[PDB]
Design a protein around this nucleic acid. Structure first.
Ligand SMILES: [K+]
Ligand SMILES: [K+]
Ligand SMILES: [Mg+2]
Ligand SMILES: [Mg+2]
Ligand SMILES: [Mg+2]
Ligand SMILES: [Mg+2]
Ligand SMILES: [Mg+2]
Ligand SMILES: [Mg+2]
Ligand SMILES: [Mg+2]
Ligand SMILES: [Mg+2]
Ligand SMILES: [Mg+2]
Ligand SMILES: [Mg+2]
Ligand SMILES: [Mg+2]
Ligand SMILES: [Mg+2]
Ligand SMILES: [Mg+2]
Ligand SMILES: [Mg+2]
Ligand SMILES: [Mg+2]
Ligand SMILES: [Mg+2]
Ligand SMILES: [Mg+2]
Ligand SMILES: [Mg+2]
Ligand SMILES: [Mg+2]
Ligand SMILES: [Mg+2]
Ligand SMILES: [Mg+2]
Ligand code: NA
Ligand code: NA
Ligand SMILES: [Zn+2]
Lengths: 208, 85, 103, 218, 129, 72, 33
RNA sequence: AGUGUGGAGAUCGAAGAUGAUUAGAAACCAUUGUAGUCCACACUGCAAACGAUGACACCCAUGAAUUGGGGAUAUCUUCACGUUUUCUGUUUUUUACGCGAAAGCUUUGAGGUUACAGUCUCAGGGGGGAGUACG
RNA sequence: UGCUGUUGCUGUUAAAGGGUUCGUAGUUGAACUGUGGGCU
C-alpha cells in the first residue's frame, strides 16, 4: 500500500485526490451492511446511508495498483463488467493500460471449456460488482485465478481476494474510480511520473 | 531439513506441499481454488524496482469469504500497508 | 417423507398444544383454526350495470354518496379451497413463496 | 501429433516442466492427458480395468442400456489415478475411462513402521475415506506383513506402491463403485496431514506460468 | 450439569483449532487443566497462555499456533501399568512416530514417553497429536 | 448418550447384556429346550426308521415335477 | 393416500376383529367353569 | 369415546325409521331420531397422547423480525406511546462450517464421531404367527 | 459377525424414546490449602 521499503510519503493522499472523491461522491453506501464490509464503514449519515472511510478506501486502491503493475503483460489481466454503466469506463481504462477487457453477459465455460474458441486463461481478474459478476467470479475459483473487485456496502465477498470499497452504483463514481486506478498504475510503471496533473480528462470514462 | 529422512541420511519424501501463511494448513494437489499473489516493491522515487513479494492463500479460506480479511492482516505484518491515519 | 417443514399449519413444536377447530365455510368440516385457509373478502352488492340503474332512481345514492358493501371472513377446509381454485398445487421450488398482504 | 490448447500444455511440450511434482506443487488442474504420458517414462505407467456393468433407463418403448467402466493407472511408486466413464458400447467406455484416469493423478505419501531403515514401505498414519455408505480405513503395518485387504482395494493399493498395511471396511462393500472411490480418497489424504516433520517454515517461489510468461506470449 | 472440568476444556481447544482460530478462552479453570497445558506447551503444540484471577474458578486465554490436530480426554480414567503402554499407543494414536498420551502418576503429570523412562504406571488422562 | 460409562457401573452393564441376548434368535435356540423337544431326531445327526408308504410330492411354483418321497 | 402399503385389510378393522374374538373365548371358558 | 348415581335436555346426532340413487346399496345424498353431546361426584388410563426426535451440561457463522423485563440518549397526546443503540429470558424465520443412504438437519443440530470416551436412563436385533395362547 | 457392540452397534422416515411429572435404592458429581531459593 502506501508504506514502502524506503519510508517516503510519495504514495499517499495529496489532498487533491481527496477533493475528487468528494466531488463525485465515491464514499456513499446503500443503507445496507454486510458482516464482511462492516470494517470499512466509519459512520452512518441521515436517511440511513452509510459513508466509507477515505483512508481505508484509498489504501486498498494503491495495493490493487501495485498488483496490476506487478504483472508484466497487460494482455494477461482481464477486466469484466456486467452493468452497462461501467461498460464505457473499462474500455477507456483498457486502452490506456493495455489490458484485455470484456463487457456484457459472461458466457459460462469461458474459463473452463478448453475445446471452445474464445477460451481464455487470464492471471488476474477485475470486476465492477461481485453480485452482478458472480458468474465470472465463480468460474475463476476453479482455475486458480485471484480477483479484484469494486465492492459496495452490501457486497458478498465470497471469492474476492482484494476488495476496493467504493460506490460501484452510479455513473459518476465508476468513471472516477477507474480514472484514478489507471493513473496510479501508470506512475508506478514509470510513465507520467511527472508531478504535472494527468492530461487525460475523466469525462471520457463516463457512460453516455 | 523439511521432510522425512531415513536413517541412511537421504530424504525419502516425494515433494513438500506449500504451507499456507494464514491458515497454516497444507495445500493439496487438487485444491484448484488456492491462489498466489505478487505485490511489487516500489522504490523511494515512486517506481517499481523489479522485485515482488508473494503470498499464498488456501482454497477453503476463499470459500468462506474470509480471504479478503486474511490479506489485510498479512500486508500489515510485512509493512506493506499502514493503519490509522 | 415429510412434505412441509411446518406440516401444513402454523403450530411450532413448543408453542401450543391444541387449537380450537372451526367449520368450513362451504361443506362444514371441522378444521383447526390455524390450518384452514382464510380470506377476507369485500364484495359490492350490485355489479356495474345494476348499480347505475339503482343509483339514478335514488335520491340518496349518487356521485357523492357511495353504496354499501359486504364484508366476510371466510375459512375453508383444504379440499374445498382446492376445488374452488382459492389455492392450487405448486411446483416444489415455488412452495415456499409467501404473501403477507393482499395483492 | 498433439498440439496443446492450454498454457500448461505448451510448457510441457516446450520441455520447461520436467516432472509431475511442479504441477502438484501449485495445484494446477490438468486438462490434457498427453501431459501425463510425456512426464512419466514409457515403462512406468500400467493400467487395468476394474469393473464393467450396465445401467438402464426406462423409455416409452422398453429401455436403453449403457455401460460404465472403471480404470486405474499408477507407477507403483507413489502415483495413482482413477477414472470412470459411461458409453453406448463397451469399447467406447473403456477408452474414455483410460483418459479420465490419467487426469486424476494424485501423489501418495509413504512412511515407516518403527525403524526408518531402507525405502519407505507403508503409509505414515491412520487414514480413512468415505464414499456413499462405504468407508475404508488404512493402518500402518510392520515389514513383511503384506497387504491385508479385500481383492478390490488390494489391487488399488499395489498400483500406489504400498507394501504393508492393515485394512478394514464398513458399509455395503458390495457396491464396488463406492468401494473403489473410497480407497482412492483414503490415499489422497496422506499428504494433507500436518506432521511434526513439516513444521519448518519456507519461502514461496513463483508459479511456472508466471516464470515463463514472456515465452507463452510468443 | 458439568461433571468433568478437564473434558470440557479440551473439547473447547480442539473445536477452536478445527475452525482455525488464533485464541480461545477456557472456563472454569483448574490445577489439573494447567498441568495438562504445560505438557502440550513443552512439546511445542500450543503457544503462550495466561491465567486470569477472579476470586473464583479462574479463566485461561491460550494462544494457538497451527500445529495441533486433536486433543481429548479419556473417561473414565483407566489404570495403566508399565506393560499397557503399547496397548494404548496402538489404540488412540495415529502412529508410532508422533503423538502422546498423558498420565497422572505418583510422580506427577507427564506424557507416556517420560513415564516409561521413569518406570512408573498411573491413570490415563488424555491425548494430543 | 446411549451407554452408561461410570467406573463403578459394572452391574448395570452385566445385566443389560444378559437381558438383550434373548433377542438373538440363534442364541435363544441354543439355550432353550423347546427346539430339541420338537426335533424328531432329538439332537442326533442321523436316525433309523421303517418305511410306511411311498408318496409323491408336487414341486412349488414356478417349477413343475413330482418329487419322490417316503413316509417313515 | 397418506400411508404406505399394508399387509392385509385396514389395521384398525383387523384389530376390531381380534377384539371380538377374545370376547368370545372369554365367554366360552366362563360357561365351562 | 365408554361406565355408575343424581341433574339438564336448545343444537347436533352412533342405533333405528322413512325417501331417493343403484344390477344390488345394508353406504355416500335428503327428512328425522334413541343413547349421547352440558353440569356435580366417583371410575376407566387409551390416541398419528407427534417434533413420529428422552433428561441435564459445553462450543458453535450471518441478516431481518417478534413476546416480557431492564439500562443509555430526535416523535405524539396530556402520564402513556413510539425513535436509535445495548442486554437477559421465550416462540420462530432467511441465506455458513459440518453431517447424512437420501429426503433433509444446522446457536432451536440429526454438527463438534473409525481422529470412535461429559453424566444418567428407556427401547431394538429378517418378515409373519401376535401383542395371539397360558399364568 | 462392529448381526450382542467394555474396546465397538442402532433408535426423524428402515425394527426401536416411555403420554407427562414426582421420587427411593443405584450410577455420576464444581473450585481451593502446592512456582523452593543462592553460587560458580
Ligand atoms: K422493551
Ligand atoms: K427487548
Ligand atoms: Mg411456552
Ligand atoms: Mg395434541
Ligand atoms: Mg395452511
Ligand atoms: Mg396421494
Ligand atoms: Mg404421499
Ligand atoms: Mg411405516
Ligand atoms: Mg353419564
Ligand atoms: Mg344419569
Ligand atoms: Mg337432528
Ligand atoms: Mg343423518
Ligand atoms: Mg332401494
Ligand atoms: Mg404430528
Ligand atoms: Mg412414540
Ligand atoms: Mg411473554
Ligand atoms: Mg436458521
Ligand atoms: Mg462410540
Ligand atoms: Mg471382528
Ligand atoms: Mg444393526
Ligand atoms: Mg418405525
Ligand atoms: Mg415424547
Ligand atoms: Mg473434584
Ligand atoms: Na342519484
Ligand atoms: Na337430547
Ligand atoms: Zn370444505
Amino acid at each position: 500500500m502506501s508504506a514502502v521499503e524506503s519510508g517516503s510519503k510519495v504514495l499517499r493522499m495529496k489532498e487533491s485526490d481527496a477533493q475528487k472523491l468528494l466531488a463525485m461522491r465515491c464514499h456513499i453506501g446503500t443503507r445496507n451492511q454486510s458482516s464482511a464490509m462492516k470494517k470499512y464503514i466509519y459512520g452512518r449519515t441521515a436517511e440511513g446511508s452509510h459513508i466509507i472511510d477515505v483512508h481505508m478506501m484509498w489504501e486498498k486502491l494503491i495495493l490493487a495498483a501495485r498488483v496490476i503493475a506487478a504483472v508484466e503483460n497487460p494482455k494477461d489481466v482481464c477486466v469484466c463488467s456486467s452493468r452497462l454503466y461501467g461498460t464505457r469506463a473499462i474500455y477507456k481504462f483498457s486502452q490506456h493500460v493495455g489490458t484485455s477487457f470484456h463487457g456484457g453477459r459472461f458466457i459460462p465455460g469461458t474459463f473452463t471449456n478448453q475445446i471452445q474458441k474464445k477460451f481464455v486463461q487470464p492471471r488476474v481478474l477485475v470486476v465492477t460488482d461481485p453480485r452482478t459478476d458472480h458468474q465470472a467470479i465463480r468460474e475463476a475459483s476453479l482455475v486458480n485465478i485471484p480477483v479484484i473487485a469494486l465492492c459496495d456496502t452490501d457486497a458478498p465477498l465470497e471469492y474476492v481476494d482484494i476488495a476496493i470499497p467504493c460506490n460501484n452504483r452510479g455513473i459518476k463514481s465508476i468513471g472516477m474510480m477507474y480514472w484514478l486506478l489507471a493513473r496510479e498504475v501508470l506512475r508506478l510503471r514509470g510513465t507520467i511520473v511527472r508531478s504535472v496533473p494527468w492530461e487525460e480528462k475523466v469525462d471520457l470514462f463516463f457512460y453516455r | 531439513t523439511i521432510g522425512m529422512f531415513n536413517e541412511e541420511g537421504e530424504n525419502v519424501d516425494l515433494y513438500i506441499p506449500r504451507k499456507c501463511h494464514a491458515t497454516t494448513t497444507l495445500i493439496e494437489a487438487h485444491d484448484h481454488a488456492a491462489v498466489q499473489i505478487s505485490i511489487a516493491n516500489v522504490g523511494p522515487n515512486g517506481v517499481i524496482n523489479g522485485t515482488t513479494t508473494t503470498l499464498c492463500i488456501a482454497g477453503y479460506l476463499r470459500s468462506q469469504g474470509e480471504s479478503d480479511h486474511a490479506i489485510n492482516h498479512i500486508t500489515i505484518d510485512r509493512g506493506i500497508m499502514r493503519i490509522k491515519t | 417423507t415429510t412434505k412441509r417443514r411446518n406440516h401444513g399449519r402454523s403450530k411450532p413444536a413448543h408453542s401450543r398444544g391444541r387449537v380450537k377447530p372451526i367449520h368450513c365455510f362451504n361443506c362444514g368440516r371441522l378444521t383447526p383454526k390455524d390450518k384452514a385457509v382464510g380470506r377476507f373478502v369485500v364484495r359490492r352488492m350490485l355489479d356495474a350495470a345494476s348499480a347505475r340503474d339503482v343509483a339514478e332512481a335514488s335520491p340518496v345514492y349518487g356521485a357523492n354518496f357511495p353504496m354499501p358493501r359486504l364484508y366476510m371472513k371466510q375459512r375453508f377446509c383444504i379440499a374445498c379451497a382446492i376445488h374452488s381454485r382459492t389455492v392450487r398445487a405448486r411446483p416444489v421450488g415455488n412452495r415456499k413463496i409467501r404473501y403477507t398482504k393482499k395483492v | 501429433e498433439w498440439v496443446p490448447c492450454t498454457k500448461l500444455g505448451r510448457l510441457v511440450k516446450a520441455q520447461k516442466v520436467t516432472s509431475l511434482e511442479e504441477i502438484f506443487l501449485f495445484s494446477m488442474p490438468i486438462k490434457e492427458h498427453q501431459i501425463v504420458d510425456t512426464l512419466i517414462a514409457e515403462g512406468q505407467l500400467h493400467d487395468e480395468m476394474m469393473k464393467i456393468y450396465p445401467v438402464q433407463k426406462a423409455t416409452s418403448a422398453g429401455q436403453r442400456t449403457r455401460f460404465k467402466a472403471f480404470n486405474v493407472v499408477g507407477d507403483c511408486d507413489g502415483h495413482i489415478g482413477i477414472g470412470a466413464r459411461v458409453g453406448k458400447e463397451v469399447s467406447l467406455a473403456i477408452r474414455a475411462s483410460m483418459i479420465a484416469a490419467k487426469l486424476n493423478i494424485v501423489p501418495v505419501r509413504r512412511g515407516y513402521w518403527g525403524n526408518k531403515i531402507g525405502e519407505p514401505h507403508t503409509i505414515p498414519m491412520k487414514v480413512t475415506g468415505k464414499c456413499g455408505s462405504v468407508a475404508v480405513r488404512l493402518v500402518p503395518a510392520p515389514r513383511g506383513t503384506g497387504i491385508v485387504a479385500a481383492p478390490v482395494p488390494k489391487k488399488i493399493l499395489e498400483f500406489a506402491g504400498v507394501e504393508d498395511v492393515y485394512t478394514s471396511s464398513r458399509g455395503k462393500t458390495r457396491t464396488h463403485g463406492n468401494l473403489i472411490m473410497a480407497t482412492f480418497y483414503a490415499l489422497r489424504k496422506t499428504y494433507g496431514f500436518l506432521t511434526p516433520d513439516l513444521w519448518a517454515d519456507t519461502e514461496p517461489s513463483r508459479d511456472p506460468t508466471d516464470e515463463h510468461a514472456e515465452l507463452l506470449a510468443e | 450439569t458439568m461433571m468433568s472440568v478437564l473434558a470440557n476444556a479440551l473439547r473447547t481447544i480442539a473445536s477452536a483449532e478445527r475452525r482455525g482460530k488464533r485464541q480461545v478462552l477456557i472456563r472454569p479453570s483448574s490445577k489439573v487443566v494447567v498441568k495438562f497445558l504445560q505438557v502440550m506447551q513443552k512439546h511445542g503444540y500450543i503457544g503462550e497462555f495466561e491465567i486470569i484471577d477472579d476470586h473464583r474458578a479462574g479463566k485461561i486465554v491460550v494462544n494457538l499456533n497451527g500445529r495441533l490436530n486433536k486433543c481429548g480426554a479419556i473417561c473414565p480414567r483407566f489404570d495403566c501399568a508399565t506393560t499397557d503402554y503399547e496397548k494404548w499407543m496402538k489404540n488412540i494414536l495415529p502412529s508410532r512416530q508422533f503423538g502422546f498420551v498423558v498420565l497422572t502418576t505418583s510422580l506427577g503429570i507427564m506424557d507416556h514417553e517420560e513415564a516409561r523412562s521413569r518406570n512408573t504406571g498411573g491413570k490415563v488422562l488424555g491425548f494430543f497429536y | 448418550m446411549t451407554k452408561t460409562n461410570g467406573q463403578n457401573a459394572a452391574r448395570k452393564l452385566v445385566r443389560l447384556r444378559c437381558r438383550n441376548r434373548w433377542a438373538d434368535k440363534g442364541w435363544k435356540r441354543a439355550h432353550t429346550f423347546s427346539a430339541r423337544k420338537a426335533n424328531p431326531f432329538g439332537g442326533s445327526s442321523h436316525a433309523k426308521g421303517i418305511v410306511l408308504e411311498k408318496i409323491g410330492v408336487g414341486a412349488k411354483q414356478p417349477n413343475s415335477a413330482i418329487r419322490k418321497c417316503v413316509r417313515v | 393416500g397418506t400411508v404406505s402399503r399394508p399387509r392385509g385389510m385396514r389395521p384398525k378393522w383387523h384389530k376390531k376383529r381380534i377384539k371380538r374374538l377374545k370376547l368370545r373365548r372369554r365367554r366360552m371358558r366362563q360357561r365351562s367353569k
